[PDB]
Design a binder for this molecule. Structure first.
Ligand SMILES: C[C@H]1O[C@H](O)[C@H](O)[C@@H](O)[C@H]1O
Ligand SMILES: C[C@H]1O[C@H](O)[C@H](O)[C@@H](O)[C@H]1O
Ligand code: NA
Lengths: 346, 339
């Protein structure tokens, strides 16, 4: 079943329920996921109206770009030319600049396929918007099926050589309450290396470090508290995790990550090379989610994309997009029950 | 009463009916007027869904900008510096460039004041969008009241010196049917001069011309067919009217123009210095409105703004917007029915 209603300020809320009774909902403001529930419990963080996003925090669950992450000094090199993008975090360009795509109302069309329902959102980034050559015709399709898979498919074409590396910014919290830390969740992540940050500004340090056998090694499932309690420099720097992890094996076919709490697991699949994980290191900010004050570590993202810092570490990849060339990315979050035995106490 | 409904592609249709039973409707797609009707008759041109505007013609009823009109070679000088804007009509920048603000979904808020209802649309034009310095935070408030007055109030603030001169692009047709020419309407217009066009590219010619006592003099009510059957080179050039008229007296209290058909009249009020009038000179294009094929001259606009061409004829005015300055503009369309 598909239901639509106004969500505030002119945005709409699109709610889908699959054959299993799982419901998930999106909004065209930022081509964003708003909620995902199983048996009455929220699996992610979200607000109850469009205004909350604009007033409290506009990133949760949004589509961010054109480039996700921080670009040191807003500087990119496109076809031998240097371009300076909007700088909204000190001299850095963070998540595409100020008032980026996550803040716009995208147009959308819903396609009902029976076992799968697709919500395709569209937006055009005009040439020069925030410094980015364009125009860029973008589209994000969010779909949910009877197998409990929520898939995100990105597509884009530019009139000019530009850069493109968007991501989905959902925050999960299997406690179903923002005021509860995700330290009690188990995390499995197929990555042997990470990208350290230079300092508090969060630009990349310049090197790639192996994390096997450290507190950031999650190849084998472990509680998130292990990282949070860590005194490793990088953890202390950000007060949790806020880094890109380099996937060891690429391919949409492999389970790159798995987040579990009791009988519920979320599996992550993607065709991208890294996953930036940020664990809501907000301290005492206490943003209210459904009237609950969010706690430090009250959520975790899995931003699949090309790792930020490629400007400094070419080995990370190349996010350039040639004129006329079609960009595509696919990321999938799948819900499972009793995938494994996870019985712990904090 | 207020009624909000889905208009397609995620856009909304907001309809307002006043004490008089008159209905006016808008959509957030392009902060635009979609319909305006009395006793079941359409007063303006409009489509039935968002899709139509995108596939047929995105201008009707829209808020166009940041700069309305044509800019020669897409070139503007800002703080002594040359800036090239998006060129979407040959080398000109027309109505702000491609995929401009008329094609975007604006956010909005409705405010019910009882005798008056306001719909405030907002949008941010990022710095650099289509070549324009910014960011520009814009708001367009469309309001309707029990006196049958449809008002448009614009406001904007820019982070950087830029240019700004938007307009409302509603097309009127008192016939209530696009397949019928507006040649039968009578027009009055308080303007003694106009801005001639250079040629078919529609860029300005360079001069300002007195129209007193010509086929374009409407200081005294006259029927459109007059102008339409004129042999004035400028009329022949565009096959109708597609020109900026300079208002003789500025100020919002003065009725600047009046469009009449029988018992029904539309008065125009504005704080802008000029009115661009375009008589839907589409030839055989035949765009479909409500299933009716549009005819050449099947509509007329009253685009109030600073006249286009100021880049070549400074006397016309200056559309610059300095950083931090608040831009404001107001245009009113008032409906009257003779009893
Ligand atoms: C909003 C968040 O988005 C990402 O996860 C960044 O890496 C974090 O530092 C923060 O900017
Ligand atoms: C869409 C129309 O908008 C204005 O009225 C212009 O002057 C006309 O030439 C046409 O471009
Ligand atoms: Na809606």
């Amino acid at each position: 079943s598909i239901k639509i209603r106004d969500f505030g300020l002119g945005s709409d809320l699109i709610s889908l329920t699959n054959k299993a009774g799982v419901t998930i909902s999106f909004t065209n403001l930022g081509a964003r996921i708003v909620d995902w529930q199983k048996d009455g419990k929220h699996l992610i963080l979200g607000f109850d109206s469009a205004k909350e996003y604009l007033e409290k925090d506009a990133y949760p669950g949004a589509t961010v770009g054109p480039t996700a992450g921080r670009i040191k000094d807003g500087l990119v090199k496109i076809s031998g030319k240097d371009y300076i993008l909007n700088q909204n975090e000190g001299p850095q360009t963070l998540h595409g600049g100020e008032e980026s795509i996550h803040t716009k109302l995208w147009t959308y069309e819903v396609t009902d396929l029976g076992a799968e329902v697709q919500v395709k959102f569209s937006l055009v980034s005009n040439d020069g918007t925030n410094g980015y050559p364009g125009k860029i015709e973008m589209s994000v399709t969010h779909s949910f099926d009877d197998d409990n898979k929520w898939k995100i498919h990105y597509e884009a074409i530019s009139d000019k050589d530009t850069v493109f590396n968007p991501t989905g910014h959902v925050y999960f919290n299997l406690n179903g309450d923002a005021s509860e830390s995700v330290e009690n969740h188990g995390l499995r992540l197929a990555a042997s290396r990470f990208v350290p940050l230079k300092d508090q500004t969060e630009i990349v340090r310049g090197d790639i470090v192996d994390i096997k056998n450290t507190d950031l090694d999650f190849r084998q499932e472990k509680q998130l508290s292990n990282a949070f309690n860590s005194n490793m420099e990088q953890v202390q720097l950000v007060k949790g995790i806020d880094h890109p992890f380099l996937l060891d094996q690429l391919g949409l076919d492999k389970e790159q990550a798995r987040l579990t709490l009791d009988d519920t697991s979320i599996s992550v699949f993607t065709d991208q090379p890294s996953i930036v994980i940020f664990t809501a290191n907000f301290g005492d900010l206490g943003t209210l989610y459904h009237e609950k004050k969010q706690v430090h570590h009250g959520g975790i993202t899995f931003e699949c994309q090309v790792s930020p810092g490629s400007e400094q570490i070419p080995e990370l990849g190349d996010i350039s997009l040639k004129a006329g060339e079609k960009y595509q990315a696919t990321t999938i979050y799948s819900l499972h029950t009793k995938l494994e035995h996870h019985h712990h106490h904090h």
